[PDB]
Design a protein around this ligand. Structure first.
Ligand SMILES: CC(C)=CCC/C(C)=C/CC/C(C)=C/CCN(C)CCOP(=O)(O)OP(=O)(O)O
Ligand SMILES: [Zn+2]
Lengths: 346, 314, 5
């Protein structure tokens, strides 16, 4: 059918407003829900329907700034929300010590990402502190953790580190040689990329791996032409109509972005079947409340609404901005970032 | 102790044992974004959690408070961290915690925080004795749970428990030969033990796979494994494979088989074989067969592959 | 649903 654009704009609007206690499990990841919504509005060119200033303040209140003595540098970045109970402070005053307050790599990523989407210039972001915190997260094998207190480590966070280093336009945030090593070691016998060495290759990790390399501008340098051809084959094989994340697994709307974006970065998305993909993504559209679901006749959510839209974007949907496949922001936003970068270089 | 849904449950703000502590409220400032509305009970538990955290109170009452915070939201990684801090401070029985987390994970098998917690505990106890069985159960309510397979590979590698995995794999491939996760597990085991250099093993495996392919010819997983373990030594270096496949074509044909053939022919062209121009035609003929009739959804891709081959070997 | 974190 058709793309109920306005319906979706209303959907993201609600998301930025108030959620039912049934989404309590997203509490510590509220910032990434904000991203899905904001970047989603951006993608629909409707950022006007929100007060960019209020949101920018909220986001800045989530930054873990270094304390007076700067003894907490290894823990700076952004929080997912205010669940720790720290007094609201839009990065105005110095950091207030707290035994367990520290950033989360996915939040620093979506945080900065959100600020740029909203037009902020990142002047209030303690870039050095963030980069200091980032470095602290990388492990000996090249991958990253999400928090300094410890967590699981895998390709998801390698992509987060990459996005952060790219946006702050400074790669001192990671040991790129080790990161690239990790990404290589994750390639499977079937040629896809997994969360880590030996694991089952997966559409999500493949995107993270490929996108990270592109962000570092070393795709061609890390993988041989033969290797890239095998990876392309693995990706292109994910399309059934919509896309699944692993062989013999049911399609899921969000993979139209995860895999589609990878195919785009590999310059062969053009050879995929557009109609069947578009038809599937739409079959998961909620014509009543808006947004998209992973499967048709299933409840919608911010994640699938956003990625479903970005999936459509890849095929240049009427009424949706072109999405920057590696940075996961609209091209418009990616450019505002280019300018923002030039500015600093003075 | 006192369950969150017990008739006699009492808000922490009304409990004697918590009279001395001042609850700490959360505040998203003037204009809150993506704000979640919380019930009295929920907000209550967490307002006290924030209090205890802020004071880094390593108390026994705090340890219990976490159980409630976890029931309200097992995705709060900070809660789990603090709980681990307390597990050490209060020197709690880790074998007991293993039961706790085993129950939790069963209820939420797709939660990142809970699998991490279990991994940390197993490291602490240096005891993997119950891991393989636990994972096998979880893999029963979802044989493709990525969290489960990831944890399984960690345990097996960390405590070198390869002895029975290849057998477990054989069993699961019988329950569902299309489970890509199991095929990956198979490669994981073999390459981490005997390896594939032993021509005896390579042979056993290629044979095993061809047998599975014959049972269910349309199975990307089986084909990817086959090509996987041979692609690096050189697909063209196995003359009997090319023929055995060409023979299967009639009855067990599928896009995967045709694709494999294309890849074999390309390996040949790559290694300046006999009949360069003749081979390229056999390849192109198949690419078109894929695009026009066998794997139409990838029509534009296969044609692209064809043009690629043609402009590289002419 | 798809849990990413
Ligand atoms: C917020 C943001 C844009 C983050 C980017 C960085 C991350 C976290 C990328 C994650 C990519 C991804 C889709 C990972 C897989 C997530 N799972 C659902 C893993 C295991 O659960 P399964 O149910 O087996 O998953 P599935 O069957 O969907 O592959
Ligand atoms: Zn999904």
């Amino acid at each position: 059918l058709d793309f109920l654009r306005d319906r979706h704009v209303r959907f993201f609007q609600r998301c930025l407003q108030v959620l039912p206690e049934r989404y309590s499990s997203l509490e510590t990841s509220r910032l990434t829900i904000a991203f899905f919504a904001l970047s989603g509005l951006d993608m629909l060119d409707s950022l006007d329907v929100v007060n960019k200033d209020d949101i920018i303040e909220w986001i800045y209140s989530l930054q873990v700034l270094p304390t007076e003595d700067r003894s907490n540098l290894d823990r700076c970045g952004f929080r997912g929300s205010s669940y720790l109970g720290i007094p609201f402070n839009p990065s105005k005053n110095p950091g207030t010590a707290h035994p367990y307050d520290s950033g989360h790599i996915a939040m620093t990523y979506t945080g900065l990402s959100c600020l740029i989407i909203l037009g902020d210039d990142l002047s209030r972001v303690d870039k050095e502190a963030c980069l200091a915190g980032l470095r602290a997260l990388q492990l000996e094998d090249g991958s990253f953790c999400a928090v300094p207190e410890g967590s699981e480590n895998d390709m998801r966070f390698v992509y987060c580190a990459s996005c952060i280093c790219y946006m702050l336009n400074n790669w001192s945030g990671m040991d790129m040689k080790k990161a690239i090593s990790y990404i290589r070691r994750s390639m499977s016998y079937d040629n896809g990329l997994a969360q880590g060495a030996g694991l089952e290759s997966h559409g999500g990790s493949t995107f993270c791996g490929i996108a990270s390399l592109c962000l570092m501008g070393k795709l061609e340098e890390v993988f041989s032409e033969k290797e890239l051809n095998r990876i392309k084959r693995w990706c292109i094989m994910r399309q059934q109509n919509g896309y699944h994340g692993r062989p013999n697994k049911p399609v899921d709307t969000c993979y139209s972005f995860w895999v589609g974006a990878t195919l785009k970065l590999l310059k062969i998305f053009q050879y995929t079947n557009f109609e069947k993909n578009r038809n599937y993504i739409l079959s998961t559209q909620d014509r009543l409340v808006g947004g998209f679901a992973k499967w048709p006749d299933s409840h919608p959510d911010a994640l699938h609404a956003y990625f479903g839209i970005c999936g459509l974007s890849l095929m240049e949907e009427s009424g949706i901005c072109k999405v920057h496949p590696a940075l996961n922001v609209s091209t418009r936003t990616s450019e505002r970032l280019r300018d923002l970068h030039q500015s600093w270089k003075t | 102790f006192l369950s969150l849904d017990s008739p006699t449950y009492v808000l922490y703000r009304d409990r004697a044992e918590w009279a001395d502590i001042d609850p700490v409220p959360q505040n998203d400032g003037p204009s809150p974004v993506v704000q979640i509305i919380y019930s009295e009970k929920f907000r209550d538990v967490y307002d006290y959690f924030r209090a205890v955290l802020q004071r880094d109170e390593r108390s026994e009452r705090a340890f219990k408070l976490t159980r409630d915070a976890i029931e309200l939201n097992a995705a709060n990684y900070t809660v789990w961290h603090f709980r681990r801090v307390l597990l050490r401070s209060l020197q709690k029985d880790l074998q007991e915690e293993m039961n706790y987390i085993i129950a939790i994970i069963e209820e939420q098998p797709k939660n990142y925080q809970v699998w991490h917690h279990r991994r940390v505990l197993v490291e602490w106890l240096k005891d993997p004795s119950q891991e393989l069985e636990f994972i096998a159960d979880i893999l029963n309510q979802d044989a493709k749970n990525y969290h489960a397979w990831q944890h399984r590979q960690w345990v097996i590698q960390e405590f070198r428990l390869w002895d029975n995995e290849l057998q477990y794999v054989d069993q699961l491939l019988k329950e569902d030969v299309r489970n890509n996760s199991v095929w990956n597990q198979r490669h994981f085991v073999i390459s981490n033990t005997t390896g594939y250099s032993d021509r005896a093993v390579l042979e056993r495996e290629v044979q095993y796979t061809l047998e599975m392919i014959k049972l269910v010819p349309h199975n990307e997983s089986a084909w990817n494994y086959l090509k996987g373990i041979l692609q690096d030594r050189g697909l063209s270096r196995y003359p009997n494979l090319l023929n055995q496949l060409l023979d299967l074509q009639p009855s067990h044909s599928s896009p995967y088989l045709i694709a494999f053939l294309v890849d074999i022919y390309e390996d040949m062209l790559e290694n300046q074989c006999d009949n360069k121009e003749d081979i390229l035609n056999k390849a192109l003929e198949l690419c078109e067969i894929l695009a026009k009739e066998k794997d139409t959804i990838r029509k534009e891709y296969w044609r692209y592959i064809g043009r690629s081959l043609q402009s590289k070997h002419s | 649903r798809c849990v990413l974190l």
